[PDB]
Amino acid sequence: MNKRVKIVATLGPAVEIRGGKKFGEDGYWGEKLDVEASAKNIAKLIEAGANTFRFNFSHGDHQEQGERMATVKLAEKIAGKKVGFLLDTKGPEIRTELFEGEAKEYSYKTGEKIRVATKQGIKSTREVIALNVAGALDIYDDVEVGRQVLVDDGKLGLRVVAKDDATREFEVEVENDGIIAKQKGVNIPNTKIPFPALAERDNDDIRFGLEQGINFIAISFVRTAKDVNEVRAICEETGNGHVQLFAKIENQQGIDNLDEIIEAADGIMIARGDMGIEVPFEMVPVYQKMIIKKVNAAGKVVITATNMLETMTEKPRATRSEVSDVFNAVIDGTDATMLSGESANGKYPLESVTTMATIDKNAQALLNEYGRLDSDSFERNSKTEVMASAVKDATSSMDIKLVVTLTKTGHTARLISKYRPNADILALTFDELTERGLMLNWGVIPMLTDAPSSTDDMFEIAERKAVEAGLVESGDDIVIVAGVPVGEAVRTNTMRIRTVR
Amino acid sequence: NKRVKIVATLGPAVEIRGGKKFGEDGYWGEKLDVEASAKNIAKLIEAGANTFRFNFSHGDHQEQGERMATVKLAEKIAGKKVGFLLDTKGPEIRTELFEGEAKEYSYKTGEKIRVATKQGIKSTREVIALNVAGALDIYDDVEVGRQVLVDDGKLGLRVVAKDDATREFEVEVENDGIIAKQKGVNIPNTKIPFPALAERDNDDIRFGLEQGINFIAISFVRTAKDVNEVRAICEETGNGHVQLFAKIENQQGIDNLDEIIEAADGIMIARGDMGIEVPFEMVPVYQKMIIKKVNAAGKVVITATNMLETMTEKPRATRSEVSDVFNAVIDGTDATMLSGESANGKYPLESVTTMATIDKNAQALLNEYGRLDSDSFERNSKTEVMASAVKDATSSMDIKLVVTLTKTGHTARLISKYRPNADILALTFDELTERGLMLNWGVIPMLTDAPSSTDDMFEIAERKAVEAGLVESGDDIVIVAGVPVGEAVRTNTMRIRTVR
Amino acid sequence: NKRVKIVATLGPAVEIRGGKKFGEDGYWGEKLDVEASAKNIAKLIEAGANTFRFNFSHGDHQEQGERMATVKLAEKIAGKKVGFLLDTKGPEIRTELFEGEAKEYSYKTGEKIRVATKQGIKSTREVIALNVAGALDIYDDVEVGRQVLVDDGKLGLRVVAKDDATREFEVEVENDGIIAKQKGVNIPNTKIPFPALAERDNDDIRFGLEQGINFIAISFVRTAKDVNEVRAICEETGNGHVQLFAKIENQQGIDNLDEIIEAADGIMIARGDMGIEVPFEMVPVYQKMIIKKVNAAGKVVITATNMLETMTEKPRATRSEVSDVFNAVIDGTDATMLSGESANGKYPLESVTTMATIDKNAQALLNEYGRLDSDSFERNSKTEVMASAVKDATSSMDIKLVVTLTKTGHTARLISKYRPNADILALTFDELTERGLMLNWGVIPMLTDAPSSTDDMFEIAERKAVEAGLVESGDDIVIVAGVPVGEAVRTNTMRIRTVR
Amino acid sequence: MNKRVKIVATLGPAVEIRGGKKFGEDGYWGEKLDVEASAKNIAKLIEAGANTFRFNFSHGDHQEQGERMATVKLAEKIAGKKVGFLLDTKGPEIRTELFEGEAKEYSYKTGEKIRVATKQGIKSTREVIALNVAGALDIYDDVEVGRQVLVDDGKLGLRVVAKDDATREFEVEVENDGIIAKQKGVNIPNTKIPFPALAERDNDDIRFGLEQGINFIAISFVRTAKDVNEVRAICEETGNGHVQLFAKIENQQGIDNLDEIIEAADGIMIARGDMGIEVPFEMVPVYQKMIIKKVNAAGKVVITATNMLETMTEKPRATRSEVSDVFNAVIDGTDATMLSGESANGKYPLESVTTMATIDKNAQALLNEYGRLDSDSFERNSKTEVMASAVKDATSSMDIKLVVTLTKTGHTARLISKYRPNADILALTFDELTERGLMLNWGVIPMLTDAPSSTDDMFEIAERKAVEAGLVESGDDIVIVAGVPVGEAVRTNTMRIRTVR
């Protein structure tokens, strides 16, 4: 059984050795990164089922990210397996300012009335809370009375009862008991704070990633198609047109514009943590299911992310709720599941990938019976779409061990993936950009091949590579799909059902 | 293109003797004109006849041999090949001659008369004698309460008692009617043990095989044995290519239909005799059931007899006849047949043209009203998966044509069975396979050189389709085959090709 | 129980005059023997005739009136009620008498002759004159290239030129044939401005309404206005219960089918005239399409003319005719019709019996082969939900009978439209609603006293069904109604009951 | 919007007042339970959506248990809504024995070799752990080499490496660093230890509960139909045949015998806690989905229980994973969701019930598009199936506000509930036992009424009670379904679609 659901693992210090020291050891940050020893740790994550590594530019500097990318390239060589490289942008942020007198935090009681300062370069007082806004942006004009200001992952709520134009301050009433600590995340739901579509930090981070060599960009806090289009303009301008963009839907404006965002993007990353703060908690499961169904309808890639196996950061076993949550992401029809802190900063990065691989493989067995996505609903206009449907019907009607597609661009692999056939998909391609770019599509095993000289040669190569890969053995039935004639840019128009010899 | 195939029975109706047309006096006086007759037969081929039926029920071997030769010339004039089908005489019961050379007698309802079972004797007014094929004694096979029907079921005699001394049936005339000499007799629901293959029929088949035929229609099939005995002769004479259609005409054949379909290559629904042998209201029931069951087995079904009966004497068919041909197509028939309308009628060409027009009109309603259902077939096999995919492709896109390169014709029969909304061009490498596909629904058989590889095979499919005028630049076709094309393998490859 | 209804046309074939039968000498001189004629008509009722058609194309009001009176006696003898349907004459064109009192002339293909439009002149071999209804001048309504068809479409005349000086058409004979005096004329694809309702049809309808009828079949309906003018007379005279069947006989009626179906209560598919007025191969196409659309509208369709035509002179139908009646049932027709077979033939009782047998046998195949599909209807209202539920019960379980108590017949018509796999007993409170349901598919109309509560309604439904002999102890029935049944409300209640 | 998914809340000190002392107050346990004060707290749980309370008879003497039941009866009057009374049996257990010398516990290192004794009535030593087995069974022949012995809710693993026939001891190896304390739960996965059906005290506990008036029994650790049949025999012999039995599926043998258990029982409680210990963690979601489908197919009640909102035991909000877990149990097709520690011993018992109610109501809105149960799948060849299917089709085809049934036994209500119509089900019954017995059926609102005199009266009562309950108003469409005549135990045979006046 091959794992059809792809795993995105976030890389961090958890797998990194410095001067023989492991993360958390005293003096760890005082040593140079040990590249070959760290690469051996990352190869184990590849072997356990990580299909793509996420480089989170929210933390660290470019030199750390570049070294990490170099460590993965060595790990691919050690493991003898390739992975996708995904860049995650920092995006806009609002943080709690510093407190006067060096005070770490203040505890507040419901009904207590305090103020929120929009002026930048000011410290916070227990009475008045100061906001560090990205770009030192003035948000006073963009928050309406009745809005909510939430502090530290939505734990504390301040209702905006009044605005004082005299000091550009928010007059709020505490809604629930809690603590306001310094440098804490702030979210103001259902606001349209005018952070620019593409900030200079995000521009630097994307151009750096593009130069290092990446296959995917996950764009943080996408609110409209423009946030996707500004990034696409950079990929096309720099001659990186192959790079695929995943919009991170984390707030109500993003949900409101989901159809236009899906059209612009190559996929969606569902960020459940931030989405849970920005929208009513009971709607997250609704938005997750709806987003997965719509992205699959568009033949695009969806990643379910954040809070998947979070307890495995500190514990070797996940909770029943966490196992259920990952399992149900697969049944919902996700292409990929993601690990953040569990793989980047946790005590059990290898166990976290292994656990997610085990849940994903188990869930894939129920996809035939309990799977939510339904291929019959699709509109098959293009001949290529018609062929993908026939492949799906073959895998439904007969015991098909593998679907083999010869694809110069990967387009046919993506169309077959979209139908969720009851078989693994071997995508034979001729360049590394296409190979790595298919690493997050459901069920796709990308592999490099030699070019066929004829249609008969192509059928022979398809069976030979499947056997050499260990995917099938004599008596197994496979479906082979290709554009004929084979040399040219002929779209996939041929299907053959073959018994492996 | 007409997807439903037409079988036309040949007879004197199209033959020119000297310079005289059928029905002119002294016609039988004149010698047969081969070239003039072939020109007329060619007109039937252009009109849409796909196979000619040689009825060994009438005429002799010399007569059958001369007509088969005339069709071969007609193929050349027309420039289109047709199938050759032999229809056997098979088992019959006829009324005997009357003593004193009387022609016939009339009877009234309620009269008590007798039917003799003794063979080689003459009838009398009071005692009708039967000429049973093989001079069988049928006295122990007919029970009291059975019915004896004379002259195409017109006059009924109810068996009320049996007389062991004379071995006679005591009968009651059920209706006013006439019993004439040499008229057909039917005893429905009886198992008269006619041999599986009689010597006369064995003889006729061996003669037709010698002349060269593609199909045999076996009259009055009652069990698989009847089909299997003819299969043995075809195999022994090196004629394994011949396809056998069992003619279902009576209750015993209907009761053993599953075993007969398994033994045969197809079924000819003989509505004339079936309407006598079973209740008249059951004929539409058996026609629909047989067409469905034959299509389920992937074999050929012919709907035959009285399709455009009135066109034997009149230039236009009845509303009922048009409805009957049309509904045969809707039921899912591979082929419709003409007997007297083409064999000895006043309008043989008009009958083929009328049948072709109704058949072509009916094929346009198959998508919405068609009674066959391709989704009903088992889909856990490579073959069923490919055919289903091909049918799905023709439904989802506007595919004009399905093309196959087939050594044996299996891919063509497989696609035909699924009844795609497209013509099927079957490119084959021998004349035996080519004429053998002439009665398969939607199949246009064509001869070509075997291809050297899968790419060559794809190129030949597109080239022949364009050459035949079946498709043009920018048209989409589906090419289906068992690769490799030289080997004999299950259909396993499909390609949707945009004709450039 | 026969689900498909039979319309039998009454005529002299069942009527005995002073002990004489139709055709014998001085038959028309004798007064009609009412009791002897009523006994003959009662046998047609017992054989399965559900409605009698009185064709006002032939005879006078006195002959029609005495015939309608005779049926009332036949209902008493049979112990069974029947519907009364009036068929209008409508617009006609007939060839005129010839000079020298010649009866007819024979013509050959390619001959050139003329057709006069002037009214009140005799024909010559060279110049055919017409009797157009109302003495309408049709010269401006017929374009060159149109066809003039004579005698049930047997002889075709192509209009090749128009002479403005004599207002004559120059025509070319298209086929060998005869023009006889007083023969029907059809000019396909023309819009001759016959009134929407001619005075003669107004007189015939008002006469029938006075006598007491349940249905009117309106001849040659071209637009909804033809239906609405008849509806106005029915409402004006207090005969708003009377249901109108539009006869679709020509291209204009087919072109306006959707508006005609909305105006009428049903459609009579007049295959005879339709086969002349449209291409012969399209008649089956229009027949299936019309049956589907009328069923979709929840209205009644009658398939008419030439169903068992040969039974006019012969005691058995052809295989094609049996197939034709059988497939009308499979297409989804509510009713089949007999014209000359029952009105003027030698075998009126046999024709009704043969049609009943075919119809009964065909209904057993509706589940597997029926073209109508109740799943196609939209299901967003209570009435559609209840009918779909009744149908599902008859599909899922072995339901013998659906029983409704209905003031207006709405629940019966709704269930009939869904074609359940069960007979429908419709218990109603008045003879007009009862007779008005006699052409709906599967409905057995019966009179009953209105119930005093829902519990009383349920016991009456079971008690009448058991006493009618429709179901027996342990059979399951479905009871459907608009509770409370005394009011005219939407079908809203269903019960599955095991009969005691 | 009426909550269709039912909530079972476990009773505990968290809502209980003792001598004016709230839980976690010094001298709390010394005080008597306060009936009136506690009833006011429990009433709030009822208003928030609790449909049944779960009682455990092991904590406190019967006098006190009687008091606790009296409080809930008082709370019903206060909230103005009736609730079901569920008793949870202790069931058979293995517990670690006392240690010699009063040692409370010992700690062990991975790879240590110790022993597990099978002899009964003896003390543990550090190197020889003794067991207290229900029924005083000898388990030596029931546990093969290679089996695992788990101590304290699966926290410490002991692998059986060998067996000693002279002492009848298991030689085991410590799998992970941990503690073995006295009186701790022991699990031996994939074994068929033939435990008695009930704990020694369960027979007395059940008999007391039946005297007090309970509607449901949840039978712990059911492995065969035999375990359900023993409890049924107690119910029938005391004249309490109305009591519904829920089998708790906690182990592999229970899953293997699921068909026979569902047949013997009135429902299944999926005990995810014990199941998580006894079967591989990744299979729990598989078994949860299969159990929900099979119980629904049998027209019986399923309860999904354990760790639904566990973090709300100590924190005011649930994790994203917990919200997802509760939501997906509804989509899977569960009749009810259950709270244990969250309502029994937690800091936020009321908030736990409100949060579960919010998630369940939100999830029921997605059942039409994403629900995994498939009513079309059911056999449709009987009158009862035909009628239920017609009601479901009516609610699918039309805007049906309510399905109303008048039922003597509750059969029509359980039949409609099984089909999961897109409407609430108002079940009018004639006795309190039938009314309380329907409290856990999906979407059923049980209500008391007088028997009708005729079919027309039954139709009038159905509409009038619905209007009175405030469930519908004039112009709303309702479906009325019943077995006429409703005075008898007849099969559902009548349906009417009625516009409310």
Side-chain angles (χ1 to χ4, degrees), chain A residues 380 383 397 454-456 484 493-497 499, chain B residues 379-380 382 396 453-455 483 492-496 498:
Chain A
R380 315 121 55 157
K383 164 192 313 188
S397 295
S454 66
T455 289
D456 287 315
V484 176
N493 54 5
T494 301
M495 176 172 86
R496 165 157 187 200
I497 306 172
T499 303
Chain B
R379 210 191 181 131
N380 182 349
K382 199 207 230 58
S396 304
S453 66
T454 300
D455 283 309
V483 160
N492 57 24
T493 303
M494 169 183 97
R495 172 167 184 227
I496 307 171
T498 304

mmCIF file of all heavy atoms in Angstrom, chain A residues 380 383 397 454-456 484 493-497 499, chain B residues 379-380 382 396 453-455 483 492-496 498:
data_model
loop_
_atom_site.group_PDB
_atom_site.id
_atom_site.type_symbol
_atom_site.label_atom_id
_atom_site.label_comp_id
_atom_site.label_asym_id
_atom_site.label_seq_id
_atom_site.Cartn_x
_atom_site.Cartn_y
_atom_site.Cartn_z
ATOM 1 N N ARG A 380 -16.950 16.975 -18.151
ATOM 2 C CA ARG A 380 -15.831 16.561 -19.035
ATOM 3 C C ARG A 380 -16.004 17.211 -20.405
ATOM 4 O O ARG A 380 -16.765 16.669 -21.239
ATOM 5 C CB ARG A 380 -15.807 15.043 -19.190
ATOM 6 C CG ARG A 380 -15.982 14.292 -17.880
ATOM 7 C CD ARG A 380 -17.190 13.402 -17.953
ATOM 8 N NE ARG A 380 -17.062 12.539 -19.110
ATOM 9 C CZ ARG A 380 -17.674 11.381 -19.246
ATOM 10 N NH1 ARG A 380 -18.478 10.944 -18.293
ATOM 11 N NH2 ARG A 380 -17.480 10.653 -20.334
ATOM 12 N N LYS A 383 -11.033 16.466 -24.420
ATOM 13 C CA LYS A 383 -10.807 15.039 -24.699
ATOM 14 C C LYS A 383 -10.013 14.467 -23.526
ATOM 15 O O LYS A 383 -10.314 13.345 -23.095
ATOM 16 C CB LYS A 383 -10.026 14.920 -25.997
ATOM 17 C CG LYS A 383 -9.374 13.574 -26.236
ATOM 18 C CD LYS A 383 -8.397 13.621 -27.383
ATOM 19 C CE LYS A 383 -8.929 14.319 -28.613
ATOM 20 N NZ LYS A 383 -7.983 14.152 -29.734
ATOM 21 N N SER A 397 -14.173 -0.468 -12.025
ATOM 22 C CA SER A 397 -14.749 -1.718 -12.605
ATOM 23 C C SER A 397 -13.843 -2.930 -12.390
ATOM 24 O O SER A 397 -14.380 -4.023 -12.260
ATOM 25 C CB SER A 397 -15.033 -1.530 -14.053
ATOM 26 O OG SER A 397 -16.040 -0.562 -14.211
ATOM 27 N N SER A 454 8.473 5.357 -30.079
ATOM 28 C CA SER A 454 7.201 5.018 -30.761
ATOM 29 C C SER A 454 6.120 4.728 -29.723
ATOM 30 O O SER A 454 6.443 4.627 -28.526
ATOM 31 C CB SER A 454 7.375 3.823 -31.645
ATOM 32 O OG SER A 454 7.643 2.666 -30.856
ATOM 33 N N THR A 455 4.881 4.581 -30.182
ATOM 34 C CA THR A 455 3.760 4.241 -29.281
ATOM 35 C C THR A 455 4.069 2.892 -28.626
ATOM 36 O O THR A 455 3.884 2.771 -27.412
ATOM 37 C CB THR A 455 2.423 4.325 -30.016
ATOM 38 O OG1 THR A 455 2.140 5.701 -30.262
ATOM 39 C CG2 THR A 455 1.280 3.771 -29.201
ATOM 40 N N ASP A 456 4.525 1.904 -29.390
ATOM 41 C CA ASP A 456 4.833 0.568 -28.815
ATOM 42 C C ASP A 456 5.972 0.720 -27.798
ATOM 43 O O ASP A 456 5.888 0.100 -26.720
ATOM 44 C CB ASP A 456 5.110 -0.466 -29.903
ATOM 45 C CG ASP A 456 3.836 -0.886 -30.648
ATOM 46 O OD1 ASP A 456 2.804 -1.149 -29.970
ATOM 47 O OD2 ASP A 456 3.863 -0.906 -31.908
ATOM 48 N N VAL A 484 -0.529 10.493 -28.228
ATOM 49 C CA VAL A 484 0.097 9.814 -29.395
ATOM 50 C C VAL A 484 -0.236 10.612 -30.662
ATOM 51 O O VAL A 484 -1.413 10.973 -30.794
ATOM 52 C CB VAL A 484 -0.446 8.379 -29.455
ATOM 53 C CG1 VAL A 484 0.050 7.604 -30.669
ATOM 54 C CG2 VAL A 484 -0.144 7.622 -28.169
ATOM 55 N N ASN A 493 -4.554 11.232 -25.398
ATOM 56 C CA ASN A 493 -5.703 10.774 -26.201
ATOM 57 C C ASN A 493 -5.726 9.248 -26.263
ATOM 58 O O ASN A 493 -6.575 8.745 -26.993
ATOM 59 C CB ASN A 493 -5.624 11.396 -27.590
ATOM 60 C CG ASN A 493 -4.289 11.135 -28.244
ATOM 61 O OD1 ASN A 493 -3.463 10.419 -27.693
ATOM 62 N ND2 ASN A 493 -4.081 11.670 -29.431
ATOM 63 N N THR A 494 -4.827 8.558 -25.580
ATOM 64 C CA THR A 494 -4.703 7.084 -25.693
ATOM 65 C C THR A 494 -4.730 6.413 -24.322
ATOM 66 O O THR A 494 -4.038 6.880 -23.393
ATOM 67 C CB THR A 494 -3.444 6.691 -26.452
ATOM 68 O OG1 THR A 494 -3.540 7.302 -27.743
ATOM 69 C CG2 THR A 494 -3.281 5.187 -26.567
ATOM 70 N N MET A 495 -5.470 5.305 -24.222
ATOM 71 C CA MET A 495 -5.574 4.477 -23.015
ATOM 72 C C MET A 495 -5.407 3.004 -23.388
ATOM 73 O O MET A 495 -6.032 2.544 -24.344
ATOM 74 C CB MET A 495 -6.917 4.686 -22.329
ATOM 75 C CG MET A 495 -7.080 3.771 -21.151
ATOM 76 S SD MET A 495 -8.549 4.112 -20.142
ATOM 77 C CE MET A 495 -9.789 3.167 -21.035
ATOM 78 N N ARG A 496 -4.618 2.276 -22.609
ATOM 79 C CA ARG A 496 -4.424 0.820 -22.771
ATOM 80 C C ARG A 496 -4.451 0.129 -21.409
ATOM 81 O O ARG A 496 -3.791 0.609 -20.493
ATOM 82 C CB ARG A 496 -3.116 0.560 -23.489
ATOM 83 C CG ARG A 496 -2.666 -0.880 -23.385
ATOM 84 C CD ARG A 496 -1.727 -1.211 -24.509
ATOM 85 N NE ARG A 496 -1.450 -2.628 -24.484
ATOM 86 C CZ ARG A 496 -0.404 -3.186 -25.057
ATOM 87 N NH1 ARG A 496 0.458 -2.434 -25.725
ATOM 88 N NH2 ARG A 496 -0.244 -4.493 -24.980
ATOM 89 N N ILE A 497 -5.207 -0.960 -21.282
ATOM 90 C CA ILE A 497 -5.249 -1.774 -20.045
ATOM 91 C C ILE A 497 -4.342 -2.955 -20.325
ATOM 92 O O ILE A 497 -4.595 -3.669 -21.287
ATOM 93 C CB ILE A 497 -6.678 -2.188 -19.686
ATOM 94 C CG1 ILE A 497 -7.602 -0.977 -19.600
ATOM 95 C CG2 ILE A 497 -6.698 -2.974 -18.392
ATOM 96 C CD1 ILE A 497 -9.048 -1.346 -19.436
ATOM 97 N N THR A 499 -1.870 -6.304 -18.834
ATOM 98 C CA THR A 499 -1.495 -7.284 -17.787
ATOM 99 C C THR A 499 0.027 -7.344 -17.754
ATOM 100 O O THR A 499 0.594 -7.697 -18.787
ATOM 101 C CB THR A 499 -2.084 -8.676 -18.034
ATOM 102 O OG1 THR A 499 -3.500 -8.560 -18.134
ATOM 103 C CG2 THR A 499 -1.732 -9.636 -16.916
ATOM 104 N N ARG B 379 -19.338 -5.404 -15.812
ATOM 105 C CA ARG B 379 -18.229 -4.504 -16.209
ATOM 106 C C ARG B 379 -16.896 -4.897 -15.566
ATOM 107 O O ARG B 379 -15.966 -4.131 -15.732
ATOM 108 C CB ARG B 379 -18.577 -3.040 -15.946
ATOM 109 C CG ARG B 379 -17.900 -2.080 -16.915
ATOM 110 C CD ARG B 379 -18.093 -0.682 -16.387
ATOM 111 N NE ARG B 379 -17.523 0.377 -17.205
ATOM 112 C CZ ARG B 379 -18.186 1.468 -17.579
ATOM 113 N NH1 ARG B 379 -19.454 1.625 -17.230
ATOM 114 N NH2 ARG B 379 -17.582 2.397 -18.306
ATOM 115 N N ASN B 380 -16.738 -6.053 -14.944
ATOM 116 C CA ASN B 380 -15.431 -6.414 -14.345
ATOM 117 C C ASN B 380 -14.609 -7.209 -15.356
ATOM 118 O O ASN B 380 -14.223 -8.320 -15.045
ATOM 119 C CB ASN B 380 -15.556 -7.166 -13.012
ATOM 120 C CG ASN B 380 -14.206 -7.494 -12.375
ATOM 121 O OD1 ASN B 380 -13.146 -7.345 -12.994
ATOM 122 N ND2 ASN B 380 -14.214 -7.958 -11.136
ATOM 123 N N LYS B 382 -11.629 -6.473 -18.892
ATOM 124 C CA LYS B 382 -10.854 -5.529 -19.731
ATOM 125 C C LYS B 382 -11.712 -5.139 -20.932
ATOM 126 O O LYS B 382 -11.839 -3.977 -21.246
ATOM 127 C CB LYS B 382 -9.600 -6.281 -20.178
ATOM 128 C CG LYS B 382 -8.429 -5.455 -20.656
ATOM 129 C CD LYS B 382 -7.570 -6.230 -21.650
ATOM 130 C CE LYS B 382 -6.094 -6.230 -21.346
ATOM 131 N NZ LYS B 382 -5.808 -6.794 -19.999
ATOM 132 N N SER B 396 -20.230 11.466 -24.784
ATOM 133 C CA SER B 396 -19.719 12.711 -24.161
ATOM 134 C C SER B 396 -19.254 13.693 -25.233
ATOM 135 O O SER B 396 -19.498 14.882 -25.074
ATOM 136 C CB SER B 396 -18.644 12.383 -23.195
ATOM 137 O OG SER B 396 -19.170 11.455 -22.250
ATOM 138 N N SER B 453 2.832 -2.037 -36.883
ATOM 139 C CA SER B 453 3.000 -1.604 -35.474
ATOM 140 C C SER B 453 1.770 -0.837 -35.014
ATOM 141 O O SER B 453 0.907 -0.525 -35.850
ATOM 142 C CB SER B 453 4.207 -0.723 -35.377
ATOM 143 O OG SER B 453 3.985 0.485 -36.098
ATOM 144 N N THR B 454 1.746 -0.451 -33.750
ATOM 145 C CA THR B 454 0.596 0.296 -33.216
ATOM 146 C C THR B 454 0.479 1.639 -33.930
ATOM 147 O O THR B 454 -0.663 2.007 -34.209
ATOM 148 C CB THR B 454 0.658 0.443 -31.705
ATOM 149 O OG1 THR B 454 0.651 -0.891 -31.219
ATOM 150 C CG2 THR B 454 -0.535 1.180 -31.150
ATOM 151 N N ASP B 455 1.585 2.336 -34.198
ATOM 152 C CA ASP B 455 1.532 3.647 -34.892
ATOM 153 C C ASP B 455 1.014 3.435 -36.314
ATOM 154 O O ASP B 455 0.188 4.234 -36.759
ATOM 155 C CB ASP B 455 2.874 4.379 -34.853
ATOM 156 C CG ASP B 455 3.120 5.006 -33.492
ATOM 157 O OD1 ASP B 455 2.218 5.706 -33.013
ATOM 158 O OD2 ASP B 455 4.198 4.767 -32.909
ATOM 159 N N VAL B 483 -4.088 -4.621 -29.092
ATOM 160 C CA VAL B 483 -2.653 -4.459 -29.435
ATOM 161 C C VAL B 483 -1.894 -5.565 -28.734
ATOM 162 O O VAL B 483 -2.148 -5.786 -27.556
ATOM 163 C CB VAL B 483 -2.196 -3.069 -28.973
ATOM 164 C CG1 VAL B 483 -0.692 -2.973 -28.824
ATOM 165 C CG2 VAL B 483 -2.753 -1.994 -29.901
ATOM 166 N N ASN B 492 -7.893 -3.959 -26.009
ATOM 167 C CA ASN B 492 -7.181 -3.435 -24.820
ATOM 168 C C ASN B 492 -6.723 -1.996 -25.006
ATOM 169 O O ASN B 492 -6.111 -1.511 -24.077
ATOM 170 C CB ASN B 492 -5.997 -4.316 -24.449
ATOM 171 C CG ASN B 492 -5.039 -4.452 -25.609
ATOM 172 O OD1 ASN B 492 -4.987 -3.595 -26.492
ATOM 173 N ND2 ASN B 492 -4.304 -5.547 -25.640
ATOM 174 N N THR B 493 -6.957 -1.365 -26.139
ATOM 175 C CA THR B 493 -6.448 -0.004 -26.440
ATOM 176 C C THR B 493 -7.523 0.846 -27.108
ATOM 177 O O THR B 493 -8.220 0.352 -27.996
ATOM 178 C CB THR B 493 -5.215 -0.066 -27.339
ATOM 179 O OG1 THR B 493 -4.281 -0.867 -26.625
ATOM 180 C CG2 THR B 493 -4.604 1.276 -27.653
ATOM 181 N N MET B 494 -7.605 2.109 -26.718
ATOM 182 C CA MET B 494 -8.551 3.103 -27.279
ATOM 183 C C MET B 494 -7.792 4.415 -27.497
ATOM 184 O O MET B 494 -6.979 4.777 -26.635
ATOM 185 C CB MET B 494 -9.695 3.327 -26.299
ATOM 186 C CG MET B 494 -10.552 4.489 -26.658
ATOM 187 S SD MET B 494 -11.851 4.804 -25.437
ATOM 188 C CE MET B 494 -11.075 6.089 -24.458
ATOM 189 N N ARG B 495 -8.049 5.105 -28.587
ATOM 190 C CA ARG B 495 -7.445 6.423 -28.841
ATOM 191 C C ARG B 495 -8.487 7.364 -29.412
ATOM 192 O O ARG B 495 -9.150 6.972 -30.378
ATOM 193 C CB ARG B 495 -6.309 6.267 -29.835
ATOM 194 C CG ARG B 495 -5.740 7.597 -30.303
ATOM 195 C CD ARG B 495 -4.448 7.359 -31.019
ATOM 196 N NE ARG B 495 -3.826 8.606 -31.410
ATOM 197 C CZ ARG B 495 -3.333 8.858 -32.614
ATOM 198 N NH1 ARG B 495 -3.465 7.970 -33.576
ATOM 199 N NH2 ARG B 495 -2.755 10.017 -32.871
ATOM 200 N N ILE B 496 -8.643 8.551 -28.843
ATOM 201 C CA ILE B 496 -9.540 9.581 -29.414
ATOM 202 C C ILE B 496 -8.681 10.477 -30.291
ATOM 203 O O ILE B 496 -7.858 11.211 -29.758
ATOM 204 C CB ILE B 496 -10.328 10.327 -28.341
ATOM 205 C CG1 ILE B 496 -11.072 9.359 -27.418
ATOM 206 C CG2 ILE B 496 -11.263 11.326 -29.016
ATOM 207 C CD1 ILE B 496 -11.705 10.002 -26.206
ATOM 208 N N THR B 498 -8.154 13.353 -33.303
ATOM 209 C CA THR B 498 -8.746 14.453 -34.099
ATOM 210 C C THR B 498 -8.177 14.337 -35.508
ATOM 211 O O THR B 498 -6.973 14.418 -35.655
ATOM 212 C CB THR B 498 -8.523 15.822 -33.465
ATOM 213 O OG1 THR B 498 -9.038 15.799 -32.130
ATOM 214 C CG2 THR B 498 -9.181 16.918 -34.277
#
